[PDB]
Design an enzyme around this catalytic site. Structure first.
Site, mmCIF file in Angstrom:
data_model
loop_
_atom_site.group_PDB
_atom_site.id
_atom_site.type_symbol
_atom_site.label_atom_id
_atom_site.label_comp_id
_atom_site.label_asym_id
_atom_site.label_seq_id
_atom_site.Cartn_x
_atom_site.Cartn_y
_atom_site.Cartn_z
ATOM 1 N N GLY A 7 0.835 -1.186 0.000
ATOM 2 C CA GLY A 7 0.000 0.000 0.000
ATOM 3 C C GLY A 7 0.871 1.237 0.000
ATOM 4 O O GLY A 7 0.377 2.370 -0.004
ATOM 5 N N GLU A 36 0.181 -11.539 6.501
ATOM 6 C CA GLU A 36 1.575 -11.492 6.926
ATOM 7 C C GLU A 36 1.519 -12.425 8.119
ATOM 8 O O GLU A 36 0.884 -12.120 9.130
ATOM 9 C CB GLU A 36 1.973 -10.085 7.366
ATOM 10 C CG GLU A 36 2.238 -9.151 6.202
ATOM 11 C CD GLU A 36 2.770 -7.809 6.649
ATOM 12 O OE1 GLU A 36 2.050 -7.112 7.393
ATOM 13 O OE2 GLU A 36 3.898 -7.444 6.261
ATOM 14 N N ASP A 64 9.391 -7.865 3.292
ATOM 15 C CA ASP A 64 9.230 -7.736 4.727
ATOM 16 C C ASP A 64 10.604 -7.484 5.337
ATOM 17 O O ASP A 64 11.581 -8.138 4.977
ATOM 18 C CB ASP A 64 8.591 -8.975 5.359
ATOM 19 C CG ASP A 64 7.875 -8.631 6.662
ATOM 20 O OD1 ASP A 64 7.870 -9.425 7.627
ATOM 21 O OD2 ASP A 64 7.314 -7.527 6.710
ATOM 22 N N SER A 65 10.650 -6.499 6.229
ATOM 23 C CA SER A 65 11.849 -6.079 6.929
ATOM 24 C C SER A 65 11.664 -6.096 8.441
ATOM 25 O O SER A 65 10.545 -6.175 8.949
ATOM 26 C CB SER A 65 12.227 -4.660 6.497
ATOM 27 O OG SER A 65 12.218 -4.572 5.083
ATOM 28 N N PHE A 140 12.831 6.868 10.244
ATOM 29 C CA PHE A 140 11.527 6.323 10.599
ATOM 30 C C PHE A 140 11.861 5.474 11.822
ATOM 31 O O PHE A 140 12.893 4.807 11.843
ATOM 32 C CB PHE A 140 10.989 5.301 9.564
ATOM 33 C CG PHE A 140 10.243 5.888 8.377
ATOM 34 C CD1 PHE A 140 10.036 7.257 8.221
ATOM 35 C CD2 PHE A 140 9.773 5.018 7.384
ATOM 36 C CE1 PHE A 140 9.382 7.742 7.095
ATOM 37 C CE2 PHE A 140 9.115 5.495 6.253
ATOM 38 C CZ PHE A 140 8.919 6.850 6.106
ATOM 39 N N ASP A 143 15.351 4.151 13.427
ATOM 40 C CA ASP A 143 16.469 4.824 12.776
ATOM 41 C C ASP A 143 17.220 5.779 13.670
ATOM 42 O O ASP A 143 18.386 6.061 13.402
ATOM 43 C CB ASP A 143 16.006 5.584 11.522
ATOM 44 C CG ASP A 143 15.543 4.659 10.412
ATOM 45 O OD1 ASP A 143 15.692 3.428 10.572
ATOM 46 O OD2 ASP A 143 15.015 5.158 9.383
ATOM 47 N N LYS A 163 22.805 6.807 3.086
ATOM 48 C CA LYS A 163 22.366 5.460 3.428
ATOM 49 C C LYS A 163 22.040 4.633 2.201
ATOM 50 O O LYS A 163 21.777 3.430 2.320
ATOM 51 C CB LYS A 163 21.106 5.516 4.300
ATOM 52 C CG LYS A 163 21.329 6.084 5.692
ATOM 53 C CD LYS A 163 20.015 6.371 6.382
ATOM 54 C CE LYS A 163 19.259 7.490 5.686
ATOM 55 N NZ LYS A 163 18.160 8.011 6.555
ATOM 56 N N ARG A 169 17.697 -2.610 2.651
ATOM 57 C CA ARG A 169 16.752 -2.479 1.543
ATOM 58 C C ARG A 169 17.513 -2.448 0.215
ATOM 59 O O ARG A 169 17.151 -3.144 -0.738
ATOM 60 C CB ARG A 169 15.938 -1.178 1.679
ATOM 61 C CG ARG A 169 14.993 -1.117 2.875
ATOM 62 C CD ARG A 169 13.912 -0.043 2.671
ATOM 63 N NE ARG A 169 12.905 -0.461 1.694
ATOM 64 C CZ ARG A 169 11.880 -1.260 1.978
ATOM 65 N NH1 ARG A 169 11.724 -1.727 3.210
ATOM 66 N NH2 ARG A 169 11.019 -1.604 1.029
#
Lengths: 184, 184
Positions: A7, A36, A64-65, A140, A143, A163, A169
């Site tokens: 989304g 999930e 997914d992280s 976020f 972080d 980064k 990622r």
């Protein structure tokens, strides 16, 4: 054309630029929700990738992280979002109070699925947890307490470009691009 | 009969007892695994019952329980097992340090599914988190830090018989019993 079930439009933008080098590939967002599940990031991605593919029946990806703290035995892990909203970064700092080992890492698992089955692609970035929140308005959640590799600044003290090559990622999509480039 | 998709035979031992008088007295364990999705206990139990029924095609029940502490916004909730094995009771005490609002509650949701669909049954036991571990060998996990209702002792300091009327699991099954007594 490879669809990304999510989304978040920003996820497709990041993917497209890391992969813009591949002129024969374009990632497109597909608004298909999926369960999930509880388990490792790998299980969440494979289950998610298959579910969506069973519905779309076209090449697709899911991702997914999570944030893993060593002294916390891998916690929060795949429940990273939940834990951030319930106890947040203050909860992690309280949990690590007096802990000698402050090592942690972020990990991303991309779940790909097509006619031929599911393939997982991973990216990780190890580091350590600061003893306090340090931020310049760049991150976020976690972080502001995560210091990557040899840095002395946390992700929230670093710009997007700083980064850009070291993140979990970035590394996961590069593993994915390798697969795409070596395609048959 | 009614099958219980669980790997713990102690759970069907507990159910059959609670459903002792019901002439239908017959809950039977069945080793069918199911994905436990991330969500609320109800969502977990609902998706799971449907998942097992789809395989078995015979009346089935599944169950999911959690420990929710108020000051931590309901954490660990449906992720209680993962949290217990990663940060433990010590981790929750750490989180609650200098916290006066120690209210918490245990919840259990049973999911039953037939050819007619799902039905959920719940049980809840309110209490508070002790300031330290206290145990006489009874119970597991967070039982050693949970003081129910108006007790002075934690779940771990009370026998099963002493917890007869304060078991979220039994309250859930008592809700399921009423449902069965109406169906036969």
């Amino acid at each position: 054309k490879i669809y990304f079930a999510t989304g978040n439009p920003n996820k497709i933008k990041e993917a497209n630029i890391i992969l813009k080098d591949l002129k024969d590939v374009e990632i497109e967002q597909i608004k298909i929700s999926y369960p999930e599940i509880q388990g490792t990031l790998e299980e969440v991605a494979e289950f998610g990738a298959k579910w969506v593919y069973n519905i779309l029946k076209k090449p697709v990806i899911v991702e997914d992280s999570g944030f893993f703290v060593e002294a916390l035995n891998g916690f929060p892990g795949t429940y990273s979002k939940f834990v951030q909203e319930t106890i947040g970064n203050e909860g992690i700092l309280k949990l690590l109070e007096g802990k000698d080992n402050r090592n942690a890492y972020f990990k991303t698992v991309i779940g790909y699925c097509d006619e031929n089955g599911v393939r997982l692609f991973k990216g990780i970035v190890k580091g350590r947890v600061s003893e306090e929140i340090r931020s310049k308005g760049y991150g976020f959640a976690y972080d502001s307490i995560f210091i990557p590799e040899e840095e002395e600044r946390t992700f929230a003290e670093m710009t997007t470009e700083e980064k850009s090559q070291i993140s979990h990622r970035k590394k996961a999509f590069e593993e994915f691009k390798k697969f795409l480039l070596d395609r048959i």
